[PDB]
Design an enzyme around this catalytic site. Structure first.
Site: not given
Lengths: 173, 185
Positions: B35, B172
């Site tokens: 992530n 993201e």
């Protein structure tokens, strides 16, 4: 150990070229203006962690710190274990000393939330494998009424720079 | 406006090649990320900010968001205004909709654990989302009038904290590959 976290926070302008290398290696060269904190580490900090690092390059031209950096929540506290610096040795309210990993550190608090500091009495030699036995610092801090929060956040071996230029290359495990 | 803040948080392995460019420009090329959240913006967020950006490249290969992103404290809230995405459009508890900057956005809330490291601590904090109903076209100057979103959230009992942290126009990524190039002002 596998570090699992990389952070670059850059505040203000100028150049801060941080490189997220393979495994635990990173590099930064800078020329700012503002402030930055860059480092490799762990998403959940621990008062028990032993941090291994090797600063292949440590060449700040002005204000920069080579330092363990992290925080807790509940309560919110930032903390530092500073092994080397540039033109400015960080200090605050003197609390005591701790011996750890072949060095002696001065213990300081600064300020609202508080920051906890261990600052090596002289710059640590760089280029060889070094250890920070964090538990030694944590226990010493406790003895001077400096207790960390219960909800641990990230923990990194960082390069911080303030309105200066320089370069660092650090490998963390 | 001049941005005064650059953020790169990268969690886990893979390659995340993020570039803090000149002015309000940044890029990210990634593959097989855990992530990451990369973004340019402001150290102190505001519910009244007008965010301008131009995504010269939006090319996720899998899960990735092109999103306004920020935090408040008191109470702790993480918020998003999602303009585009990859294979996965983010959702949560549906609250309503808001029209802003030529688009319509669905409003969602989600919950995350506040203290996963503490055994027996099951307390949570809330995330607020505006997610565009269809992907926003990229390559031209785009605006996010954040106040429109804050006001709509308020009208659904979703109040932001009083203590504002950073506020960025972010890329993201989550277990994916891709590339982005964005200029923020």
């Amino acid at each position: 150990a596998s570090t699992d976290y990389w952070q670059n926070w850059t505040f203000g302008g100028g150049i801060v070229n941080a490189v997220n290398g393979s495994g635990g290696n990173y590099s930064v060269n800078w020329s700012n203006t503002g402030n930055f904190v860059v480092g490799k580490g762990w998403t959940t900090g621990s008062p028990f962690r032993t941090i291994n690092y090797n600063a292949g390059v440590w060449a700040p031209n002005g204000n920069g710190y080579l330092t363990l950096y992290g925080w807790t929540r509940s309560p919110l506290i930032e903390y530092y274990v500073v092994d080397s610096w540039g033109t400015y040795r960080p200090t605050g309210t003197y609390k005591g000393t701790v011996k750890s990993d072949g060095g002696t550190y001065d213990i300081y608090t600064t300020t609202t939330f508080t920051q906890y500091w261990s600052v090596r009495q002289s710059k640590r030699p760089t280029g060889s494998n070094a250890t920070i036995t964090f538990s030694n610092h944590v226990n010493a801090w406790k003895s001077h009424g400096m207790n960390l929060g219960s909800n641990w956040a990230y923990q990194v071996m960082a390069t911080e720079g303030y309105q200066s230029s320089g370069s660092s290359n650090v490998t963390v495990w």
